[PDB]
Structures are given as C-alpha cells and as structure tokens.
Amino acid sequence: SGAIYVGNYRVVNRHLATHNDWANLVWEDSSRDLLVSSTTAQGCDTIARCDCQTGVYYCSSRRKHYPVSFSKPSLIFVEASEYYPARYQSHLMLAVGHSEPGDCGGILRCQHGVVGIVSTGGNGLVGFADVRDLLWLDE
Ligand SMILES: CSc1ccccc1CC(=O)N1CCC[C@](O)(C(N)=O)C1
Ligand SMILES: [Zn+2]
Numbered sequence: 001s002g003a004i005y006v007g008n009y010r011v012v013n014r015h016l017a018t019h020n021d022w023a024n025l026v027w028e029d030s031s032r033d034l035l036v037s038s039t040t041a042q043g044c045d046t047i048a049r050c051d052c053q054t055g056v057y058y059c060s061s062r063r064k065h066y067p068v069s070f071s072k073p074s075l076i077f078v079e080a081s082e083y084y085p086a087r088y089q090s091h092l093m094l095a096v097g098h099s100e101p102g103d104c105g106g107i108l109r110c111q112h113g114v115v116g117i118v119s120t121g122g123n124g125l126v127g128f129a130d131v132r133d134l135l136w137l138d139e
Contacts (some may be wrong), residue, residue, distance in 0.1 A: 061099070
C-alpha cells in the first residue's frame with residue numbers, strides 16, 4: 001500500500017486501486033500499472049522533474065528506507081499475476097534491493113522530489129513505476 005498526493009490528485013498502483021479511485025478516475029494505464037484519481041483535499045508531495053538514477057525508497061516489509069541506483073524508464077517483461085497476464089510494463093525502473101508484494105506503493109525519491117512508486121520485484125530486484133514524465137500532475 002501507498003500513494004502520491006500531489007495537488008488535487010492521488011497516484012496509486014492500478015492493481016491496488018479502490019472503488020473510490022475508479023469513481024473519481026482522472027487517468028489510468030494498465031501497461032504502466034498507474035491509476036490517478038481526484039481528491040477534495042490538497043496534496044503537498046513534490047514530483048521530481050529530472051533524469052536522476054540514484055535515490056531512496058521506502059520498503060514496508062523491512063520498515064526501512066534504502067538507497068538505490070536505478071535504471072532509465074523502459075519496457076521490461078513482468079511475469080503473469082492475478083491482476084495481469086504476462087506482458088511488458090512500460091516506464092519501469094529496476095534496482096538491486098529487497099521487495100515483497102505488499103511493498104507496492106512505497107515512494108522512490110531523489111534530491112529533486114518524488115520519482116515514482118514500487119510496482120514490481122523478485123530475486124533481489126525492485127521495480128519502480130516512474131511519474132516524472134506526467135507533467136500535468138503539477139498543472
Ligand atoms: C513489489 S511487488 C513484488 C515484489 C517481490 C516479489 C513479487 C512481487 C509481485 C510483483 O512484482 N507483482 C505482482 C502484482 C502485479 C505487479 O505489481 C505488476 N505491476 O504487474 C507485479
Ligand atoms: Zn532527481
């Protein structure tokens with residue numbers, strides 16, 4: 001669990017979206033595992049607008065933050081699950097680090113702000129869904 005709260009938006013993993021998120025849907029992309037819904041109260045998270053490949057992520061399965069080097073956003077094969085058949089997820093960034101299924105939603109940050117949220121993992125690797133390109137989150 002976990003979300004990005006910026007302005008009047010709530011950014012979450014699409015496979016963990018609630019009924020309220022679908023009733024207040026702004027945008028969703030299955031290929032990116034992202035869903036953005038609207039909120040009545042303001043959000044104060046700052047989105048990083050950058051090309052950083054180092055940062056820190058929150059890992060709820062360990063209750064610890066971890067520094068990571070991560071790849072550039074791209075198309076990576078993600079194995080079939082109860083939410084998706086086997087497919088390439090786009091805008092995904094990989095790093096060496098611990099993750100477990102309940103870790104989706106943990107924020108990845110750099111000095112510039114929020115980079116994305118935990119989306120995939122397995123075998124000593126953790127995958128992050130990038131949000132830096134979603135310029136409309138600020139506007
Ligand atoms: C941090 S998730 C994780 C971590 C360690 C081991 C296994 C996982 C599960 C995992 O990767 N997914 C299952 C749910 C759907 C998924 O989020 C997607 N975007 O397709 C992928
Ligand atoms: Zn940055």
